[PDB]
Amino acid sequence: ATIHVDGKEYEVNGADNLLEACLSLGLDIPYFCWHPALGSVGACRQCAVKQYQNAEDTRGRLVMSCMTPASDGTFISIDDEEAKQFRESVVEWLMTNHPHDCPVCEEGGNCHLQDMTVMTGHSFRRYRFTKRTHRNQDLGPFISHEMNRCIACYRCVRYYKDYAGGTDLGVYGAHDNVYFGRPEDGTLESEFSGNLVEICPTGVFTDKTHSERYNRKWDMQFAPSICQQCSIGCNISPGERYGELRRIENRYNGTVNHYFLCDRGRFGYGYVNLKDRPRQPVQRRGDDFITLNAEQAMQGAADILRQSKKVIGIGSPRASVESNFALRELVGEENFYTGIAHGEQERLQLALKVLREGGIYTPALREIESYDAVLVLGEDVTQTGARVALAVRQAVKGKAREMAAAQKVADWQIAAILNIGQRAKHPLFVTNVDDTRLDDIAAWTYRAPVEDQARLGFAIAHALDNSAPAVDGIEPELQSKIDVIVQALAGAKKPLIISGTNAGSLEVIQAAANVAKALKGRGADVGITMIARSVNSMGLGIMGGGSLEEALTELETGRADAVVVLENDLHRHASATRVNAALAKAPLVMVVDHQRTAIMENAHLVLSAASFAESDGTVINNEGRAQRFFQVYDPAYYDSKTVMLESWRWLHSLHSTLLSREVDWTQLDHVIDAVVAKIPELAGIKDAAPDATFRIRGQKLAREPHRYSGRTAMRANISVHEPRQPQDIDTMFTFSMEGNNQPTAHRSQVPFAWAPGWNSPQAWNKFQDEVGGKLRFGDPGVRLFETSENGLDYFTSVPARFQPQDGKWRIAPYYHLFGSDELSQRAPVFQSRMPQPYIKLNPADAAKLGVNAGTRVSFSYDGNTVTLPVEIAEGLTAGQVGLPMGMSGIAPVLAGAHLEDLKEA
Amino acid sequence: EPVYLPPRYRGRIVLTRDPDGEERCVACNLCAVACPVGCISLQKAETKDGRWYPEFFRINFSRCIFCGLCEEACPTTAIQLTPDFEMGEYKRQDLVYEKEDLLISGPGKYPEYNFYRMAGMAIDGKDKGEAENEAKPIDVKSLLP
Amino acid sequence: MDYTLGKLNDMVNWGRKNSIWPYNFGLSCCYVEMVASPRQADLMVVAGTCFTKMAPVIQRLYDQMLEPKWVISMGACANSGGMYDIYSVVQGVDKFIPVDVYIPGCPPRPEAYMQALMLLQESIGKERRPLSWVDQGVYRANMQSERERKRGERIAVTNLRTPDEI
Amino acid sequence: GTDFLTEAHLDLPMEFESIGKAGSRLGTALAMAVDHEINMVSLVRNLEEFFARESCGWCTPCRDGLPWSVKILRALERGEGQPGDIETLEQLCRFLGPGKTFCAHAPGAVEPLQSAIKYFREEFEAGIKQPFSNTHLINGIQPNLLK
Amino acid sequence: EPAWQTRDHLDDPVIGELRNRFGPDAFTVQATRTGVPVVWIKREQLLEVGDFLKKLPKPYVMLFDLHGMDERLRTHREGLPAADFSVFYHLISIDRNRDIMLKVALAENDLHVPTFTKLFPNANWYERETWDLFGITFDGHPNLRRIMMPQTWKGHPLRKDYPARATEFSPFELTKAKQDLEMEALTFKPEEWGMKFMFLNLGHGAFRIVLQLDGEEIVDCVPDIGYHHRGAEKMGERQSWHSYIPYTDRIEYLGGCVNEMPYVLAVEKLAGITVPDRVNVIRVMLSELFRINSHLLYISTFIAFTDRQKIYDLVEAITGFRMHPAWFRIGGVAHDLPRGWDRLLREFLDWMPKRLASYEKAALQNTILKGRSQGVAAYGAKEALEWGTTGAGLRATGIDFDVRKARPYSGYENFDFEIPVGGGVSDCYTRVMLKVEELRQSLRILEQCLNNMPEGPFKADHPLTTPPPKERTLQHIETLITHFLQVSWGPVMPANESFQMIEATKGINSYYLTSDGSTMSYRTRIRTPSYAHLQQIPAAIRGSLVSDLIVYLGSIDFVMSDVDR
Numbered sequence A: 001a002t003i004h005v006d007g008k009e010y011e012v013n014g015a016d017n018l019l020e021a022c023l024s025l026g027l028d029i030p031y032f033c034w035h036p037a038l039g040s041v042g043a044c045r046q047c048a049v050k051q052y053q054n055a056e057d058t059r060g061r062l063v064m065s066c067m068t069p070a071s072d073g074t075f076i077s078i079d080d081e082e083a084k085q086f087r088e089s090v091v092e093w094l095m096t097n098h099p100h101d102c103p104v105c106e107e108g109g110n111c112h113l114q115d116m117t118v119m120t121g122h123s124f125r126r127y128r129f130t131k132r133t134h135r136n137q138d139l140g141p142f143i144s145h146e147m148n149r150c151i152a153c154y155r156c157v158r159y160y161k162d163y164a165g166g167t168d169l170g171v172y173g174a175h176d177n178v179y180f181g182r183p184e185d186g187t188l189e190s191e192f193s194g195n196l197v198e199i200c201p202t203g204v205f206t207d208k209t210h211s212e213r214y215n216r217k218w219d220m221q222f223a224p225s226i227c228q229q230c231s232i233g234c235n236i237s238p239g240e241r242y243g244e245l246r247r248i249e250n251r252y253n254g255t256v257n258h259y260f261l262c263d264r265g266r267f268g269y270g271y272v273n274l275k276d277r278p279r280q281p282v283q284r285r286g287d288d289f290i291t292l293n294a295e296q297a298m299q300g301a302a303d304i305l306r307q308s309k310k311v312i313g314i315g316s317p318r319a320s321v322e323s324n325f326a327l328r329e330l331v332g333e334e335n336f337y338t339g340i341a342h343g344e345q346e347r348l349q350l351a352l353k354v355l356r357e358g359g360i361y362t363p364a365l366r367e368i369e370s371y372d373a374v375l376v377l378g379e380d381v382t383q384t385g386a387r388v389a390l391a392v393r394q395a396v397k398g399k400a401r402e403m404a405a406a407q408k409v410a411d412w413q414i415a416a417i418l419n420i421g422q423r424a425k426h427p428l429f430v431t432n433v434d435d436t437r438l439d440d441i442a443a444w445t446y447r448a449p450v451e452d453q454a455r456l457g458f459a460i461a462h463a464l465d466n467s468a469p470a471v472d473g474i475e476p477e478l479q480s481k482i483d484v485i486v487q488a489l490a491g492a493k494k495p496l497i498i499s500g501t502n503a504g505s506l507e508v509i510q511a512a513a514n515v516a517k518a519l520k521g522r523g524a525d526v527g528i529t530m531i532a533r534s535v536n537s538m539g540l541g542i543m544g545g546g547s548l549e550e551a552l553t554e555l556e557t558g559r560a561d562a563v564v565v566l567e568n569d570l571h572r573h574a575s576a577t578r579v580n581a582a583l584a585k586a587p588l589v590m591v592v593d594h595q596r597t598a599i600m601e602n603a604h605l606v607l608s609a610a611s612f613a614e615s616d617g618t619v620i621n622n623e624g625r626a627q628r629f630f631q632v633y634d635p636a637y638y639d640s641k642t643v644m645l646e647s648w649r650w651l652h653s654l655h656s657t658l659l660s661r662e663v664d665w666t667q668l669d670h671v672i673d674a675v676v677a678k679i680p681e682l683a684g685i686k687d688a689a690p691d692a693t694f695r696i697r698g699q700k701l702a703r704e705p706h707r708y709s710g711r712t713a714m715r716a717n718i719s720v721h722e723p724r725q726p727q728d729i730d731t732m733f734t735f736s737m738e739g740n741n742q743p744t745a746h747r748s749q750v751p752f753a754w755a756p757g758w759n760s761p762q763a764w765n766k767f768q769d770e771v772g773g774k775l776r777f778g779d780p781g782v783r784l785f786e787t788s789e790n791g792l793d794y795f796t797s798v799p800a801r802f803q804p805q806d807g808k809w810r811i812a813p814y815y816h817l818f819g820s821d822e823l824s825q826r827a828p829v830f831q832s833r834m835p836q837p838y839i840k841l842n843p844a845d846a847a848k849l850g851v852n853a854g855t856r857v858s859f860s861y862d863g864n865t866v867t868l869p870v871e872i873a874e875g876l877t878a879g880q881v882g883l884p885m886g887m888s889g890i891a892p893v894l895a896g897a898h899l900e901d902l903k904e905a
Numbered sequence B: 001e002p003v004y005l006p007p008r009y010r011g012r013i014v015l016t017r018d019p020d021g022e023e024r025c026v027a028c029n030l031c032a033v034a035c036p037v038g039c040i041s042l043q044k045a046e047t048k049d050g051r052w053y054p055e056f057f058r059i060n061f062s063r064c065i066f067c068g069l070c071e072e073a074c075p076t077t078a079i080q081l082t083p084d085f086e087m088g089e090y091k092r093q094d095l096v097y098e099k100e101d102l103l104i105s106g107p108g109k110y111p112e113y114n115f116y117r118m119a120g121m122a123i124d125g126k127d128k129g130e131a132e133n134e135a136k137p138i139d140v141k142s143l144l145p
Numbered sequence C: 001m002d003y004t005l006g007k008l009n010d011m012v013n014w015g016r017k018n019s020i021w022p023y024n025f026g027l028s029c030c031y032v033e034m035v036a037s038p039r040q041a042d043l044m045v046v047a048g049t050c051f052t053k054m055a056p057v058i059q060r061l062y063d064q065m066l067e068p069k070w071v072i073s074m075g076a077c078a079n080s081g082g083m084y085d086i087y088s089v090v091q092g093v094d095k096f097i098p099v100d101v102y103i104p105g106c107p108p109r110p111e112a113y114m115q116a117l118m119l120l121q122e123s124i125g126k127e128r129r130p131l132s133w134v135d136q137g138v139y140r141a142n143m144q145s146e147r148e149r150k151r152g153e154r155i156a157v158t159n160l161r162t163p164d165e166i
Numbered sequence D: 001g002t003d004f005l006t007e008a009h010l011d012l013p014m015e016f017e018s019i020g021k022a023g024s025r026l027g028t029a030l031a032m033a034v035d036h037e038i039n040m041v042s043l044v045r046n047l048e049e050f051f052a053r054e055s056c057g058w059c060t061p062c063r064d065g066l067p068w069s070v071k072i073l074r075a076l077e078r079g080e081g082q083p084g085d086i087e088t089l090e091q092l093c094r095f096l097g098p099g100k101t102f103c104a105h106a107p108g109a110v111e112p113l114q115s116a117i118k119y120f121r122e123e124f125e126a127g128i129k130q131p132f133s134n135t136h137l138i139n140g141i142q143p144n145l146l147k
Numbered sequence E: 001e002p003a004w005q006t007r008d009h010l011d012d013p014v015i016g017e018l019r020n021r022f023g024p025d026a027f028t029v030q031a032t033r034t035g036v037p038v039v040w041i042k043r044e045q046l047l048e049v050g051d052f053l054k055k056l057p058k059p060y061v062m063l064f065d066l067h068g069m070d071e072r073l074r075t076h077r078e079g080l081p082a083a084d085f086s087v088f089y090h091l092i093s094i095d096r097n098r099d100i101m102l103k104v105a106l107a108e109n110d111l112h113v114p115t116f117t118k119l120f121p122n123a124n125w126y127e128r129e130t131w132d133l134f135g136i137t138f139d140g141h142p143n144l145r146r147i148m149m150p151q152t153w154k155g156h157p158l159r160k161d162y163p164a165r166a167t168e169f170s171p172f173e174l175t176k177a178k179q180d181l182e183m184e185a186l187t188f189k190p191e192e193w194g195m196k197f198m199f200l201n202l203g204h205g206a207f208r209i210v211l212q213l214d215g216e217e218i219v220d221c222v223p224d225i226g227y228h229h230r231g232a233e234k235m236g237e238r239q240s241w242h243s244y245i246p247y248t249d250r251i252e253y254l255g256g257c258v259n260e261m262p263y264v265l266a267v268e269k270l271a272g273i274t275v276p277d278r279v280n281v282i283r284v285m286l287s288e289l290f291r292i293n294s295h296l297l298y299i300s301t302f303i304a305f306t307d308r309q310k311i312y313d314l315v316e317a318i319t320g321f322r323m324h325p326a327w328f329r330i331g332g333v334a335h336d337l338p339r340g341w342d343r344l345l346r347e348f349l350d351w352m353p354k355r356l357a358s359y360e361k362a363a364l365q366n367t368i369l370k371g372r373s374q375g376v377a378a379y380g381a382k383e384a385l386e387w388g389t390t391g392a393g394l395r396a397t398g399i400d401f402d403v404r405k406a407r408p409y410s411g412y413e414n415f416d417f418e419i420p421v422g423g424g425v426s427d428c429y430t431r432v433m434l435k436v437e438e439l440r441q442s443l444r445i446l447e448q449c450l451n452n453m454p455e456g457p458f459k460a461d462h463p464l465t466t467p468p469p470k471e472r473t474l475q476h477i478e479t480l481i482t483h484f485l486q487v488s489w490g491p492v493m494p495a496n497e498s499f500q501m502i503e504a505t506k507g508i509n510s511y512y513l514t515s516d517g518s519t520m521s522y523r524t525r526i527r528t529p530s531y532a533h534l535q536q537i538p539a540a541i542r543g544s545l546v547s548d549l550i551v552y553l554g555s556i557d558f559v560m561s562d563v564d565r
């Protein structure tokens, strides 16, 4: 297509509208109601341009560029006089009722309405009458509501309802009294409600957790990082001020998590600011905890380790690839253990083997939205991999997109698409132990134990391909529903099979692999997705090592006297009594961690590791994508006594002091080169980010905006002398504003979006090749493995049907977005949001045991009687008991385990 | 003899109070970013009624060039430059003036302005609709069309 | 009060504070506002921006001065570097020579310099120094800071003149 | 939602095109007569209160520009109009035409205001009786006296 | 068509002359808001283009400026040749009353230009500063050494990859520099300073001049400058357009608002702001008050603290500060004039005539001062033009060139005042006479300012006026929004280049601003007259005595902060 804007000629896409085409060309058109992910509706009337019929047309006509297709030979004018006056008048009409609130507004300096008011040139008020006002609502602990600042752009309701599928937000009232909010006071129920603080162009919806410790955007120190709260690997921009983590902003990645986070990643950063975090190396002596600096801690640990006969290491999926590799080099490959349980490790390696040996392509998170049928087996994705659930919702709405495309309706005209596709949707079949949050759009939901879900998967695979093993004992109703699933999956152009390790069953993963193989054998374009548990679960699986049970056995027999535990609390993956006994028997326990854990009471040495905000490293995605996260701030900049080093720095210095009796800390690129040298499967982490010598025309990449304030006052209460700027030898970023953050800079890692005239999250438009697409020079992060040429064989181990045994209760896992993750549940803002720990009972089982709802029952697991109140679960199959994994006292390793002596307290 | 100073004289910086007696500063951080030297540092805190205020407010007067850009950028007329020049010290750390060294007992050069009488954000003593040029809030459940 | 490392001691303190021979070293635009060899001088008034090239000159002329020596820094430049946090400017003259009295301002008034002279005389009169070198330790008083001494009268200020007058 | 016409337009046929060239619309063809006892400012005020309170709230010009015209017409009704009010009304009629708003409710809203300003302008000018002001005097700050 | 409109100046006769001489495909015309034809010349044609401009019928006789620009970070280079670096040459034709800016593009791997010192002798210090701050080599330069930074400095500060902030202070480097200064006379090399008899080192500002003496006669001299270098241009790349104003104050500290005027006029050209008449009169009045203060100080130092005190009292009444007001704003001034300013100005203008007559009696008719000052180290129009001399010296050579009349700015065309010119000889006495007559004319301008002062706004009605008027900021939400974004992120200047040249207290001061579309200046170039006046010293006192050099140093109006910026 060819368009002529203001006399200049441009080549654009004809399938795009004029607003997105002109924004992709660098032209500035003000807009409110349009969003790249939400489509065009024509509400705010801000994007007005003057369209002419041909080249010899002088009158023209004002049209909305978001509602006008960028067809071939289209003549428009942005800088036309009448269009400029109309856009200024739209800004003025919005300004008539807007409150005098900018100094006490959390959106100030980050506000799209401020930027568009300045951009249109409106600065003079001639409206003299009263402004309408509104009462606010309580929206829960995360989102603060200020209804006075609304411009009625309908972005919130469109995102929350049409995109995110939420039900408790809406627009109420009439003409100029339109109210956007909930029908009553209460917490927003959506798992993706936190994206409202960037979707809303004004300060109506603000980050309440940030509002507690508010600072402006220009005062922030940003870094490009990876969210640590599950395996999905969403790109984030942590922003700090005065030595504490203050906000998590969405960092655009056109391949992974483009505009949207989930609420866990956005609001579960509060564990970084906990005051009980270790900040110095601490050595115990008798009952005295003496504080050491880094050098003498390294020397004492090196001599004590050298006096030992065998040192073993226990890694964690919390830690990065570099930290786990440094531990593996410190103790040796034969003495390195992964730190997760044996069954968890087996499920993780099975998922990994399906990913890089199953011969079936695994899609990225953005690519999930293009699949025409989804089968989810055992993985409650909303509570474990929430952004995958959001992408599955988009893939489900793909059917309405298809029927609209058949009627020659443009893909950005979202209201017409939704009107054509009323309730027709792509097939979604979710299986779980109970009801999921995806059941509102699912074509079918299967509530059954994990062996029954695996049997359903194997039956689907056998009905798709007769070479797959069959399942004996299928009821005709279940057989008919299996036939419905098979007819839906066979007729799909792009079927997608999603599973994961959170179900706690190996056979569910095997059944999902068999379904994917059966769909691959029919020539379909089948994709497979595996949801891991933690941020670097797949990297720990790729690196490998022994299980936690083997390390505990080595400590308990006495073959190992020294144990180094890296970023692992050890109670989520093993029984607490066994861990306590093994660590009390061990004469030397060293714990390298950034959070106060229960195993630090028995620790001889505690090394204060850095969290993700204070460390660099690489983490491996659930789809096998290596992604580098960068340090946000120096923890020793304000508190000079703080010795909080990177975990790989601690372990490399420990290995150097053990070998040559001298301290060499490290550089990060040296550890990365060591990883790609000793481990060839992790050789792709070299290309995840450029090294520390990378420059943009000779200068580093800036971590803070150019108007960063208080450079001679922020530390003045400690010392009037300004300290040295912290040096970053690890990465290409500088801990200052003396750097580059140009949107045209040839790089992939962007710490924050800012452009002149665009101070809001709409500044991400300038950093993309086309708006809503990819980053201009490619998205960061590379895939570790490609699709294998040949797949796996059919798994013939079909599990038997679930049989309830008397006195034994099979534990059905119930994951929660707020609580099941360890670090996020340590955050103080998650304590109010997470619920009380209930235990789920079938009505028949509760009636047999004589307990109603809310009554406390006590059960013994591993010789430990704990009591929980009973919640009646209708969908849970009898013979099962429901437990919330990841909570305090209920380890995620309990999923799939049995349970004895369920007695009323 | 005492030295005469004009009322516009750019001397010692103070934080002033509203006519109701509350401190005028809403901790909006405009003065800190407008400072070319970067010698203002402050943090926003919020009271129980929702009123924004500075948790701390420090000015490095060993760095301050007394240019008055912070007073120019203040949207509440809190920070002001007053006719006073006797500010010499013995130690440079003593030129770091905290909030208790700046907050005077009166309105200073602007005797009547109150920012919170203009802002729509509700605080104690001013609910929604009681600010200047504001109508009462109309519920969407009201019977009037 | 605290000291950081007898009638005639008061006499020498009185004579030293009541006759100060200054050496005004004017680096920059503080020099015009404030308007003897260093071997015959005892007070160094450093007024102006401390450049990297002229910092050895300041250090040499301070080293040529004879004991006892006091230093008064005028203006934000000599105090901390002022507005010039830049590659060619030393951030404060106290980076390399000790300073007795600091004056804020850019530029300060001459009466501010006279008030700092009062402060210097008070600090001289409240100090104990080795009388004859035949304890050879200089004891400087930890004086109460001026901002806490004058805090009550400063905070008690309520109304000021409006800026619409001359 | 139709433009006002005068007594000189009483002789044209009730057709779509004939009333189209006259500057109005045939509409529902149910005409309404306005006698000399009716203040045109009051009548247009009543019309604009109806049109402003019947807005659906979807799009900015109707939703946030019809109440501005209502408040201006109330000020003209009370004799509290200020200079620039009629210019603001004319700008509102220009910027609420077809294509500028999401639907045709606001062009129909601004048709009678346009025609009444065009014909009976003297009553609207008679509504203005006080000087323009939307700034209080802040003590200690000299205003920027624009010319 | 306002005065800030983007123009290519294709109708300038110099463009047609260059097209006829060199061909239509030899240069590229750039459209700017500098008011100047900007012509991109190939590097190999630079010397012949300059020689052609030197031999025009109304030739370009003065090299006004010469410096560099790092174009590597510049994103809006549409209509420009491919350049990693560039060197610009600002040339002035006084007879034509015109000017031209030649620009040479340079690749990063080949940073060398032919020297301009054969065509214009004042290009020596400009090329030395360009080599010092950008690393651009000039082939054929006699002594291409650093002039702002010391000779042991590493890197080039004005490059975009050089960090602007102050580094960590090291006592070891201080002791090394002090030991180098102590043994500077012991290990002095005459060839290292550009020379080829006794050598003297000695220290308007403390600057060191190395002197070669035949017994007592000055044979050669090279001054060591850069001791007052504050990095003001690099700070121009680090401050927003609004927050850079006090830095403009501290360039020529006796000028104050005179120094603020060209910067705010150039920013207003970038912003497309036409200020109202009252802003023009207020700026002219403050500029003339500061010009009177500077001229009084110069005359008194040549021969006092009371008229300057009255000037400072009036300036302190208006702006709240005496010497560094920082009162000018983008689009106007910071506040309105306080009520009672007219009575203060009336009392100032009644005290001044008899004092001015007293200065005339004490300076012009002083026979001993006339004998001491007349004919000692003088120069003519040819030496003034070839060295970039402006202000009192250039007009003392007889060339009637004042910016307030030749290229009027800030409404100076609405005032009635004369421009005094001397004979053909520019010595101390003629310059003092010219400054006394300029004092009288500035008093005339102040009287005209007082007599009919316009009533109106003190700030423009533009959205980019920074900051907005305070009462509307405190009352109106859109004005509050504009103020919020202007004081925090900064006003957004659309990408362009602007230039403003004004008549400062010591000559011609100019600001050349390059905006890359951001809220910070991409390039701020300050041309100061004292740099050019100090460069021409060795060409004027060659063969004189040291006392003659002292008298000549006191006779030229210069300050080292203005020299080194």
Ligand code: SF4
Pocket: A098, A099, A100, A101, A102, A105, A106, A107, A108, A109, A111, A112, A113, A114, A149, A201, A202, A203, A204, E481
């Ligand atoms: S939403 Fe934006 S324009 Fe409105 S008060 Fe907040 S910062 Fe100001």
Ligand code: SF4
Pocket: A149, A150, A151, A152, A153, A154, A155, A156, A157, A180, A199, A200, A201, A202, A204, A205
């Ligand atoms: S609350 Fe925010 S997103 Fe929703 S309509 Fe109002 S301004 Fe738009």
Ligand code: SF4
Pocket: A227, A228, A229, A230, A231, A232, A233, A234, A257, A261, A262, A263, A264, A265, A266, A384, A385, A386, A387, A388
């Ligand atoms: S889906 Fe996972 S990786 Fe993404 S924001 Fe949520 S917790 Fe973080």
Ligand code: SF4
Pocket: B034, B035, B036, B037, B038, B039, B040, B059, B063, B064, B065, B066, B067, B068, B069, B070, B071
């Ligand atoms: S007067 Fe200027 S230098 Fe001092 S604190 Fe205010 S803005 Fe900063």
Ligand code: SF4
Pocket: A103, B024, B025, B026, B027, B028, B029, B030, B031, B032, B042, B070, B073, B074, B075, B076, B077, B078, B079
């Ligand atoms: S600009 Fe004023 S209200 Fe805002 S933080 Fe500074 S002193 Fe407080």
Ligand code: SF4
Pocket: B065, C028, C029, C030, C031, C047, C048, C049, C074, C075, C076, C077, C078, C082, C105, C106, C107, C108, E250
């Ligand atoms: S403190 Fe201010 S007046 Fe003094 S030398 Fe520095 S810039 Fe000049």
Ligand code: SF4
Pocket: D054, D055, D056, D057, D058, D059, D060, D062, D063, D101, D102, D103, D104, D105, D106
């Ligand atoms: S013009 Fe139509 S779409 Fe727009 S708000 Fe009015 S009634 Fe709704």
Ligand code: FES
Pocket: A019, A030, A031, A032, A033, A034, A041, A042, A043, A044, A045, A046, A047, A064, A065, A066, A067
């Ligand atoms: S962005 Fe086009 S009308 Fe809202």
Ligand SMILES: [Ca+2]
Pocket: A614, A615, A616, A631, A728, A730, A731
């Ligand atoms: Ca690091």
